Amino acid sequence: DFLTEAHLDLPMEFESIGKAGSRLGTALAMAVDHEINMVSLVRNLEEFFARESCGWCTPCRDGLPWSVKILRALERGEGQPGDIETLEQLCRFLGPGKTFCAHAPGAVEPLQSAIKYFREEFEAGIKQPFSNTHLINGIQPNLLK
Amino acid sequence: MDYTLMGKLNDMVNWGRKNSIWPYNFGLSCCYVEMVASPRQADLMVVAGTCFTKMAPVIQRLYDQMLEPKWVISMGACANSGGMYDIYSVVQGVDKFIPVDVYIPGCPPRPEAYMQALMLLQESIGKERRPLSWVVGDQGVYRANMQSERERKRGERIAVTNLRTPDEI
Ligand code: SF4
Numbered sequence: 001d002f003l004t005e006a007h008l009d010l011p012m013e014f015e016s017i018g019k020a021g022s023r024l025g026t027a028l029a030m031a032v033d034h035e036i037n038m039v040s041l042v043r044n045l046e047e048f049f050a051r052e053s054c055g056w057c058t059p060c061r062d063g064l065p066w067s068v069k070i071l072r073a074l075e076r077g078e079g080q081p082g083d084i085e086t087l088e089q090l091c092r093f094l095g096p097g098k099t100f101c102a103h104a105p106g107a108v109e110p111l112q113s114a115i116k117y118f119r120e121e122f123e124a125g126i127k128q129p130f131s132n133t134h135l136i137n138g139i140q141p142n143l144l145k
Numbered sequence: 146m147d148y149t150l151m152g153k154l155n156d157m158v159n160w161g162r163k164n165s166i167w168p169y170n171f172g173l174s175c176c177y178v179e180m181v182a183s184p185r186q187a188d189l190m191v192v193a194g195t196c197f198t199k200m201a202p203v204i205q206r207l208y209d210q211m212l213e214p215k216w217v218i219s220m221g222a223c224a225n226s227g228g229m230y231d232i233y234s235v236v237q238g239v240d241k242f243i244p245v246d247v248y249i250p251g252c253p254p255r256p257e258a259y260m261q262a263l264m265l266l267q268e269s270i271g272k273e274r275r276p277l278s279w280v281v282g283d284q285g286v287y288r289a290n291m292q293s294e295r296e297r298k299r300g301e302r303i304a305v306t307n308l309r310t311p312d313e314i
């Protein structure tokens with residue numbers, strides 16, 4: 001998970017970084033400057049994680065590419081309402097125990113933390129109204145509320 | 146044309162039967178109240194409704210009360226085949242027990258469908274051969290094997306291309 005400037009005083013231990021909503025991992029930290037957009041960084045991360053899926057189990061194999069496509073839409077400014085909620089549901093349902101191995105929880109940890117902290121960039125990605133239906137001529141659509 | 150078992154007056158008799166038709170409308174079911182004489186005087190029986198087994202004998206009795214010549218129009222899916230009621234208490238079609246001259250699909254048909262039935266029956270009588278008297282001539286009826294209304298209207302029906310879309314009144 002991404003951590004902020006306030007977490008920089010944490011000792012590099014398993015328990016302290018775990019208590020802050022992240023994990024110590026390899027203890028090889030990566031610093032992100034203000035010139036880096038979080039949506040592009042998380043799009044790059046999820047592109048790696050989705051193409052490094054082993055293809056065995058459904059949530060990683062088929063929901064990491066969905067997060068990749070949502071992040072590409074948000075990076076191009078073509079986001080639509082419900083995208084952030086879809087990302088959060090993907091983060092919740094790819095957690096520990098839902099997938100066969102631990103690749104997908106590690107994949108959704110940065111997406112979780114980036115939405116948690118830098119949410120304004122993700123909401124800045126949303127610029128289009130939601131649509132996945134085109135009009136069929138003789139059929140009046142069911143206008144859901 | 147083919148028929149299934151001195152000439153001008155035969156056509157005059159056919160014309161007199163054609164433009165003078167007295168119907169006996171049988172109620173039966175919903176087809177009657179959509180489409181709205183003694184059976185001795187009537188010469189056309191219009192059966193419009195379900196042939197329930199309890200009153201198929203009534204239909205057959207009031208058909209046998211009519212006199213020669215007698216024609217039958219069957220209105221609606223029930224009278225045609227049993228329709229949507231293929232069930233224990235329903236006879237599957239009028240033509241199971243009395244002969245039918247014109248069949249009209251619909252559930253119910255429109256009143257104008259009944260009027261078109263009247264036209265179809267009118268040329269059906271208009272080119273049929275019936276005996277002049279009980280002692281002179283051949284005592285057999287000859288119904289004309291007409292071209293089917295779906296074969297005649299095939300080209301104009303197939304030539305239809307576009308219809309109004311269903312989002313309007
Ligand atoms: S979570 Fe692990 S087992 Fe499942 S498809 Fe991804 S890499 Fe394979």
Ligand code: SF4
Nearest residue numbers: 175221222223252253
């Ligand atoms: S064909 Fe339809 S409308 Fe006519 S009697 Fe039967 S159920 Fe009623």
